[PDB]
Subunit: 255 residues, 2 copies
Amino acid sequence: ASPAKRIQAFTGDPDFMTSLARGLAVIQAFQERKRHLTIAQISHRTEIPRAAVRRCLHTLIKLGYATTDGRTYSLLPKVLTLGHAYLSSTPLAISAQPYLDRISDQLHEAANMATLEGDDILYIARSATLSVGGRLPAYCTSMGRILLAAMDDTSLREYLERADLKARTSRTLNDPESLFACIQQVRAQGWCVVDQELEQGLRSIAVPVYDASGQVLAALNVSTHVGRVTRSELEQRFLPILLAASRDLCHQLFG
Amino acid sequence: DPDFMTSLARGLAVIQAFQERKRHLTIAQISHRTEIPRAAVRRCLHTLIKLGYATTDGRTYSLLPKVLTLGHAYLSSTPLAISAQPYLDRISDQLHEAANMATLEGDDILYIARSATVERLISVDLSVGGRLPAYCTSMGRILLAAMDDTSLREYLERADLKARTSRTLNDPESLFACIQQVRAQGWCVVDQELEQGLRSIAVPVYDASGQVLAALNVSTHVGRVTRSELEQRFLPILLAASRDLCHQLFG
Ligand SMILES: [Cl-]
Ligand SMILES: [Cl-]
Ligand SMILES: [Cl-]
């Protein structure tokens, strides 16, 4: 369950660097921790013993990833360059941006691209009018139902009964049966509109990003407010634009 | 150093080896670029794969999107980066040009926050987490101006001073005199020394101690704003935002 339990699950593998896993887990311990963190606080978050956590922080400090006053610790901007290593080496992310920017300019709305990681979607590219590297739940987002629809029937049920299908609004689908029917309908449309299931006033439309082999690599969407655009404009104007841009992107990376 | 975790340093350096390599990498390439022995690289990659940070097909390796969340841990736990976004956004919304915030990382500046305005640097596509040389960017001249004279001269005697354009200052003497004027000015304009058509003005961000933490800038196209307007109009807005961000963070 905990980050430590994940690390110690490989303790029988001789090629698994426990201290590198712990160090990466220490970086993750700062997620959404607006203030700075002590050793004890990080050791409670991750269940990593304080001695290891201190040595991880000490190591990150000497490498320029972190700083301290002796009591609290905070990450340094150099950590951002780690995410850049993924961006500047991933052609999908690089080639999506001009499409994301043009979509945003035509419609005056935010446009995004996410992949699936576990039970969440991970925003890998944005074009704003909440952040690259940020996560949202898959079951109640447009881009997530796209990527849940790409799953085979086996992996989808394993997700549904294992995910926290918490109800966020009056309209959020929160049970596996309702969601599976929803996914079956996304599967048949090849697009997805979610209306105010993540938070009120928010309504978005997503389409899949394919490779030349047919696999869904990712999803593309547009984020709108319910008061400005209607479901009619979403499906009759936004959808053809998103599909045109998605096929252009597919053809550009993979012929 | 007994508290230094070598495999953690190597793993992070393995990640960094993928910068600007849009092609899957071998053990051999990563070892050559980082000087890390091949066996240690192998184990580092194996650990990254098991943790979901990287993937392989048996021969080559590439990073997975989960690496992006590492940077998100910095952005969502640092007041400097959280509080600067509203300032950057209202600046770009007032002047209709891009606004940015950067710090000094080694010899480069590091972009840690951007406004929503699209500014397509043709020479290098710029994202959050990307770097630019300090000697020829507005924000870089600010953060170099914060160096003492000794550290500055050490930088100038080793840095790569490529003449990006015909206007780029690319010799240590000119940069030195240019930095010294940035010191006394409190701001810096770079006119098309990084790329043609690009011109920016930058100011420093201080802490309560008076130390330069970062720089704010406005990135403009030369066909949208005259040099007078960068300094008559864009400049005072940058100081006000900087001093407000400083007060909001340190009082
Ligand atoms: Cl090692
Ligand atoms: Cl030129
Ligand atoms: Cl001019």
